[PDB]
């Protein structure tokens, strides 16, 4: 659910993920940020401009401060570009973004 228009922090983020294996993304919230039903984590190609450019996404898990979603291998890009996790608010605002990674 994108548009054409650091409260969340990603941790444990690897630089290379195994191609065709499930990927588990880990994150916590910060500065009394509280989540909502329709916040999502997307996988984005580095250099994207609009939240419409997610490769794939998943709605967040609502509630140990740690949080995680499980991206099944078939949600995952199969090329060699740089990618990055991004937590998007209910109102399209980016509230976090991870370090770049590849599937290789």
């Amino acid at each position: 659910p994108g548009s054409t228009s650091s409260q969340v922090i990603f941790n444990s983020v690897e630089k290379f993920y195994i191609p065709g294996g499930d990927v588990t993304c880990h994150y916590t919230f910060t500065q009394h940020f509280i989540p909502r039903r329709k916040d999502w984590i997307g996988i984005f190609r580095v250099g994207w401009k609009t939240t419409r450019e997610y490769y794939t996404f998943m709605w967040v898990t609502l509630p140990a401060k740690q949080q995680e979603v499980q991206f099944k291998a078939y949600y995952l890009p199969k090329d060699d570009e740089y990618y990055q996790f991004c937590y998007v608010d209910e109102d399209g605002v980016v509230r976090g973004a991870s370090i770049p990674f590849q599937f290789r």
Binding site: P1, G2, R52, T56, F57, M58, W59, K72, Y75
Partner: protein
């Protein structure tokens, strides 16, 4: 003493030997009926383990099948709920991209033909 007294003795020994034999048979039957019942009991020991092991192994096997089918079902179906939302998003956005690309291609060819 006499020849006659020997015959008399010998006849008693025949009956004595027949009686002793009769009682050996009785003791042999009592002893075999005891060992028969130890055999019946040793066998029930074995059979109690064999039957109950085989039955309990079948219980456990089917319990494990049920459990794993239910864990599989549950996880597969919480996955479908996530896949459903993705596919609605993807199929819809892709159809718009297709339309936007057609409009841009129409704009390009109008600009090349000027």
């Amino acid at each position: 003493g006499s020849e006659f007294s020997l015959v008399a003795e010998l006849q008693e020994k025949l009956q004595e030997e027949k009686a002793k034999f009769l009682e050996q048979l009785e003791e042999q039957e009592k002893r075999k009926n005891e060992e028969m019942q130890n055999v019946r009991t040793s066998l029930i020991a074995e059979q109690q383990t064999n039957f109950n092991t085989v039955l309990t192994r079948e219980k456990m096997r089917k319990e494990n099948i049920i459990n794993d089918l239910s864990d599989k079902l549950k996880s597969t179906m919480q996955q479908q709920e996530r896949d459903k939302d993705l596919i609605e998003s993807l199929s819809e956005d892709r159809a718009r991209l297709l339309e936007e690309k057609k409009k841009l291609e129409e704009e390009v060819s109008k600009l090349r033909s000027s």
